[PDB]
Structure 1
Amino acid sequence: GSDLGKKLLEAARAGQDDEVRILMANGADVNAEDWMGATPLHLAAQSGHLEIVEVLLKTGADVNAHDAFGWTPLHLAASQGHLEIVEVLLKAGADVNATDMVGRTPLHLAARRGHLEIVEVLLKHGADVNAQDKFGKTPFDLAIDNGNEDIAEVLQKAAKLN
């Protein structure tokens, strides 16, 4: 047939690591893209499938691929709260300050979604506390706007150390 990439995307999304292996062993492209521009690495990162993320990174997946929204796998993991995946992606060379279609970095998304440990990991890897999205908002602003007081404090303190 020829639905290899399509099936690999589905297997990565569903966390079916055995199917991921089978499809890759049969020639499926690890950098296949779905209708939204998401790759297997995007889909595994979104759904929290750590081990599939790790194996894709070992087998040629592009850590900095962006989808139609401008989201990278790191945006997705940071937004969804998958701390270990965030760490693995950063270790593999993910751009900590990549911006999506509205100018938001992974730190914006983690701050908005209230993921404190991810905020701290992103800061450790050089995330930009002063980054403004297309609406002029910093991650601190998005933390305030979403009632994430503890994250806002962490961000306000980090801005003093620049």
Structure 2
Amino acid sequence: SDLGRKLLEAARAGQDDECRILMANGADVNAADNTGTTPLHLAAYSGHLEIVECLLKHGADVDASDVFGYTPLHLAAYWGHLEIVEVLLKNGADVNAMDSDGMTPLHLAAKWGYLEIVEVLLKHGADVNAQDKFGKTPFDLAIDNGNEDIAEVLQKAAK
């Protein structure tokens, strides 16, 4: 429908007030585009905290998956959006969700040097022993990407 699209675009562009109205007008909060990405994905992807909070308020599926197996949490960790991660986790996001390549949010965070986020994920039970389709663990990816401080943290959490 039109409302669904408007909502996706409003989320993408970070139009809080626009998104607000679309909710009032009965926009499908769980609308999906050609690649199965929902408004929550896009809000998490762009780093629009308030929109994320509003979407969740209106029953947005916190663990929705696109064609790549990506969930909002994956996108949040991917771009280093700390606050949004904490919110998604608070709303019952699967901290160990796996994408098409078997990557978990912890894999992504460790890979792209997001220390503070690595910590938050660990608090909520992120599995340090999870392996992607290459047998790589968050530790392996930390080391491979020259993020030593994070690697050291992960190593100490496994013991």
Task: Provide TM-score, normalisation by structure 1.
Answer: 0.97
Distance 1:129 1:52 in 2: 30
Query: Secondary structure, in 3 states, of the residue corresponding to 1:67?
Result: coil
Which residue of structure 2 aligns with residue 46 of structure 1?
A: 45
Aligned to 1:129: 128
Using the TM superposition, give the Cα deviation of residue 3 of structure 1 relative to its aligned residue in structure 2, in angstroms.
Answer: 1.0
Alpha-carbon distance in structure 2 between the residues aligned to 1:89 and 1:9: 18
Cα deviation for residue 21 of structure 1 reads 1.1
The amino acid that maps onto 1:41 is L
Q: Secondary structure at the match of 1:23?
A: helix
Displacement, 1:46?
0.5
Is 1:120 aligned with 2:94?
no
* Separation in 1, partners of 2:142, 2:34: 31
- Distance in 1, matches of 2:108 and 2:126, equals 12
Q: CA deviation at 1:88?
A: 0.3
Any gaps of 5 or more consecutive residues in structure 1?
Answer: none
Per-residue deviation, residues 104-161 of structure 1 (Å, max 9, x unmatched): 100000001110000000000000000000110000000011111111000000111x
Matched, 1:35 2:49: no
Moved over 4 A (4+): none
2:108 aligned partner: 109
Deviation at 1:25, TM superposition (A): 1.1
- For the residue of structure 1 that corresponds to 2:77, the secondary structure is helix
Q: Does 1:6 align with 2:10?
A: no
> Is 1:99 aligned to residue 103 of structure 2?
no
Q: How many residues are paired up? A: 159
Cα distance in structure 1, aligned partners of 2:37 and 2:4: 12
Check whether the contact 2:20–2:54 (CA below 8 A) recurs between aligned residues: no
Distance 1:111 1:34 in 2: 29
Q: Distance in 2 between matches of 1:37 and 1:148?
A: 32
Q: CA deviation at 1:23?
A: 1.2
Residue equivalent to 2:21: 22
Identity %: 86
Residue matched to 2:60: 61
Deviations 1:25-72 (A, max 9, x none): 111100001111110000000000001101111101000001110000
